[PDB]
Amino acid sequence: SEVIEGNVKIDRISPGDGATFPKTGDLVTIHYTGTLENGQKFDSSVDRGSPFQCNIGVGQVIKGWDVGIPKLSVGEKARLTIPGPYAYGPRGFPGLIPPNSTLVFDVELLKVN
Ligand SMILES: C=CC[C@@H]1/C=C(\C)C[C@H](C)C[C@H](OC)[C@H]2O[C@@](O)(C(=O)C(=O)N3CCCC[C@H]3C(=O)O[C@H](/C(C)=C/[C@@H]3CC[C@@H](O)[C@H](OC)C3)[C@H](C)[C@@H](O)CC1=O)[C@H](C)C[C@@H]2OC
């Protein structure tokens, strides 16, 4: 596991084309599962049967996603461990994430665009 910006950790699980990497502003199609540090699952889009899309690195998602995702190539599966300051910090999210939580994200880069 690699320690990227802000102390976010990447655990590579299954490779991508090792060549198609998301660039700033690129639209990404991802499948994620979010868990707290205890393993307690709080969200998943796989459960929704619909992948998430956002433009990467422009402030649309929490910073751990912004620093994290661009280091993945199309088709890869990896796990992002994100500390509070790079996620929801001291505020959290009502009914999902408590103040100061470290978030674990299992994500799959389906397509870059
Ligand atoms: C108003 C319209 C609702 C709009 C909802 C959608 C488009 C649907 C989309 C599937 C979101 C999920 O809803 C099904 C749901 O995703 C979580 O469950 C989740 O796993 C998560 O953490 N995600 C989602 C995947 C990207 C990383 C992170 C994120 O960065 O998400 C972003 C996030 C909340 C950023 C805040 C931005 C404000 C800053 O202040 C804060 O700064 C700390 C960080 C999302 C993408 C916002 O851009 C847009 C929205 O919120 C949140 C725990 C609760 C959130 O509910 C909404």
Side-chain angles (χ1 to χ4, degrees), residues 3-69:
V3 187
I4 68 154
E5 307 86 340
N7 270 335
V8 153
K9 278 151 181 182
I10 303 180
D11 286 295
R12 312 269 186 177
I13 295 171
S14 127
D17 70 357
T20 309
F21 291 96
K23 311 257 265 196
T24 279
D26 274 347
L27 185 71
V28 296
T29 309
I30 318 173
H31 249 312
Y32 71 88
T33 291
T35 280
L36 301 174
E37 236 192 341
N38 57 31
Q40 162 184 328
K41 160 178 157 178
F42 65 78
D43 193 13
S44 185
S45 60
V46 155
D47 282 351
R48 278 194 298 284
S50 49
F52 176 69
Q53 310 193 134
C54 61
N55 312 89
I56 209 70
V58 310
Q60 291 179 183
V61 298
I62 58 171
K63 300 182 170 185
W65 266 58
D66 270 352
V67 302
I69 305 294

